[PDB]
């Protein structure tokens, strides 16, 4: 294969030297990849692409996957060979997303990984450990039950209980003004739900685009309900990685980059009372969250990691074996 | 027979008046300055066109924004205003 | 004569008349004030409010309603108290080009055009789609709806007044007698 | 895929100014108050009429003097100008 | 829309598509009337224009000045999110008897058309007798081919013995013996490799508007940058490009003073057309497409054939779809 380069920052410029691909940001060379080690390109947003680069890529059979600023997947500059991958694996997905042993194995692994990661999030505080020993033991007790539950509703109940037991404790971390008690409301009335909502939407959109780029049909889900108004597979795989948004939100509120000044109380056109985040603060928060997405690991960024995971799941469906797909668990 | 609608835009204050006084006979003043007309033989259309040309020579500015848009049976059938009212419709048999 | 006079006014379209469409627009304190003026001060009126402003439980989700607005469908007091204070909508039907004609414990709805109804219906449909998305994604648990209760099953299986949407879910009807489309040779 | 002709005469100039500026984008200004509009799907027609309702509510005049006509493939063929020039002819393949 | 000119720069309005050459506006086409767009040359397309054409599901095909095909900007979400017809096609295309019957039809049509085009040159009949008979023999075996793997070899041999005979009609400066595809390196081959992409873009836009997914093919399994289904259907209609080229070369419209020769990107002898000759050639080709057999242009014949193919696939009968088979 090779590097699957993803540009999700802010207005890079792509150029070719006729034997390399050079991505510059403010005339500082950020990427320089040989055309023999490049496998695809993903453009999330507005990124100018010099015409010799586009011709050189099309001549070498390297698809360019184009996606919107929010994260909606539109299409791709391709040819025959790179576009055979977008449809050569549609039938097997529809077969193997309904067979219950396979689907339930994967849906057991996903919830195992989610509860593991939300244990790890509390493990790293190391300052209020004594108050959290009970909560961590409870989460271990709930995690050990997922290995045996042989139905979807049992999984839903276990994950719901674990999530409630995980959010009941954040009042120790946040400052006085940001203390929140009641569950999340669709029109928010507290700041922390607003921050979490922005994070969840951004992560869902980017996961959806990266899943579609690998050749998947994102409405056929393995663990969630096949439905309109959302993509099942994207909201399905994104569960393992949900701790990044929560950790980042706690970090932002604690270190003072967002204060009480930035939130604005208003009434929408529908008349319902809302509290929202100001435009400067919203831009700052979105930029910081994408930065955390880019700082995922030294080797891979998050988007390349999700592409590799999608390839693993594709192989698992292709060979019918339900345990070749190992899920991300944040092992130390 | 052929159904046309005539739409014209002329700035000479008297020439516009004379075209307004001419075209009201052949068809109804449907809009402020848009008329609908109907002919059975094209020589009758040519006679009207020549009358229009004779009138517009007195402008001395050579205005030419006068358009004859055709109207079919199915075209009339699909036409409507915003309210949904069918427009430019004609009767088959008036039982006065 | 009233129908023909209204046609002369411009109201060329009619609607099927159902009181249900007006359940989501009732402003309760006006109704309670009118009853308090007619029957006098009484301790029942408080109780009446407590019957009308309750919250629905569906699958561990609390669907509320905007305070001091609406009458619950599927209740016995609602059809009686809806047409008791129907006339108060007349001004709000006048600004939007709607008229109601009453006869024989019934009425009929007259309108000039059908664009605001379709815009209200399309706004309601989009709002319900976003609410379902934010059910399934952000794990919301208390949902406050202002309109659209008739499609409350959909979640699980500028402002226009809320009766416009319920009218827009329907398709209206229209009300030298010519007799057809002209032929090749002409009209007879 | 339907062709349409858009015409109006709204009394106040500022009220119809927003009509004109809205309608520049959808089709060329073929004459002083006449537009040639091309549509692919009726939902665009519905939203355009919704906005026209918006501005006529803004005007507070209740102007129904907006008229849409159809233009078929052969209705175009007999359509022309006074000097015989064919009008409203849409190209099949532009070889720019 | 086609852009075979010289160095255009497409930009957008969010409602219209504007084509500016050196800050001079050349066209302002509305997005409600646009059907496809082809970019032959060094034309630009701003990224928001790509967003708008990818939202409205308008195909755009790309090529280079030599004329060889490069790729396309297509989307993989269906028309109204209804994945019905795509799933039907992806099932039906790999069924062996159905696909074999249609591939046999397409090959028999192509060989009959080639025999016919070699049959209307009277003055060279004595030179062209034996070859025609050999093509007949190849056709005599296409009915007896029982596996889909043999059709590629039979059609290849037919095309070889057909193209070897063009040295008799053409002038001496345009002679050739082999169809060189990826780097066109002959004066005559650039004409064919520039007409095939216009033909392919037409049939591909028609097929994608019908409801198909053009990437999967019946007879063309392994392809090189051509969508397999469009390059499968246009097999019967590709003597309209191998007759127009002979007509253009013989009747003095295009002569060897037009070709420009260069070395490209590493050094390879590449022959191309200047901008004006490209515009004349493409305009003439589209004009000859319009003057198809009377009462029907080529677009209105390809949509008919696409509907007939769809009805053949939905009813699971291979007999409903009938290849074109130019008149005896």
Residue numbers in the entry:
A (entry chain F): 650 to 981
B (entry chain B), D (entry chain A): 1 to 96
C (entry chain E): 436 to 592, 617 to 634, 641 to 653
E (entry chain C): 654 to 981
Source paper text:
In some CRISPR systems, a reverse transcriptase (RT) fusion to the Cas1 integrase and Cas6 maturase creates a single protein that enables concerted sequence integration and crRNA production. In this work, we determine the 3.7 Å resolution structure of a naturally occurring Thiomicrospira Cas6-RT-Cas1—Cas2 complex using single particle cryo-electron microscopy (cryo-EM) and investigate its activities in vitro to elucidate how RT activity might coordinate with the CRISPR integrase and with the Cas6 maturation nuclease in the context of a Cas6-RT-Cas1 fusion protein. As observed for previous CRISPR integrase structures, the Cas6-RT-Cas1—Cas2 complex is heterohexameric, consisting of a central Cas2 dimer and two distal Cas6-RT-Cas1 dimers. In this study, we identify a type III Thiomicrospira Cas6-RT-Cas1—Cas2 complex containing three active sites for CRISPR spacer integration, reverse transcription, and RNA processing, and we observe all three activities in our reconstituted system.
The structure of the resulting Cas6-RT-Cas1—Cas2 complex was determined by single particle cryo-EM at an overall resolution of 3.7 Å. Approximately half of the complex displayed relatively lower local resolution, and refinement using a mask that excluded this region generated a reconstruction at 3.4 Å resolution with improved interpretability of high-resolution features. Portions of three Cas6-RT-Cas1 chains that were excluded by the mask were then rigid body docked and refined in the full complex reconstruction. The final model consists of two entire Cas2 chains, two entire Cas6-RT-Cas1 chains (excluding five poorly resolved loops), and the Cas1 domain from two additional Cas6-RT-Cas1 chains. Extending from the Cas1—Cas2 core are the Cas6-RT lobes, which are positioned orthogonal to the Cas1 domains relative to the central Cas2 dimer. The Cas6-RT lobe is connected to its associated Cas1 domain via a flexible linker, with the RT domain proximal to the central Cas2 dimer and the Cas6 domain closely abutting the RT domain. We observed density for the Cas6-RT lobe in two of the four Cas6-RT-Cas1 protomers (Cas1b and b’), presumably due to flexibility of the Cas6-RT domains in the other two Cas6-RT-Cas1 protomers (Cas1a and a’). No density was observed for the DNA substrate despite co-migration during size exclusion chromatography and indication of binding from electrophoretic mobility shift assays, suggesting that DNA was bound in only some of the complexes collected or that the DNA was lost during grid preparation or is too flexible to see. The most notable is an RT α-helix that serves as a direct connection between the RT and Cas1 active sites. While the N-terminal end of the RT-helix α9 is attached to the β-sheet containing the RT active site, the C-terminal end points into the catalytic Cas1a active site center.
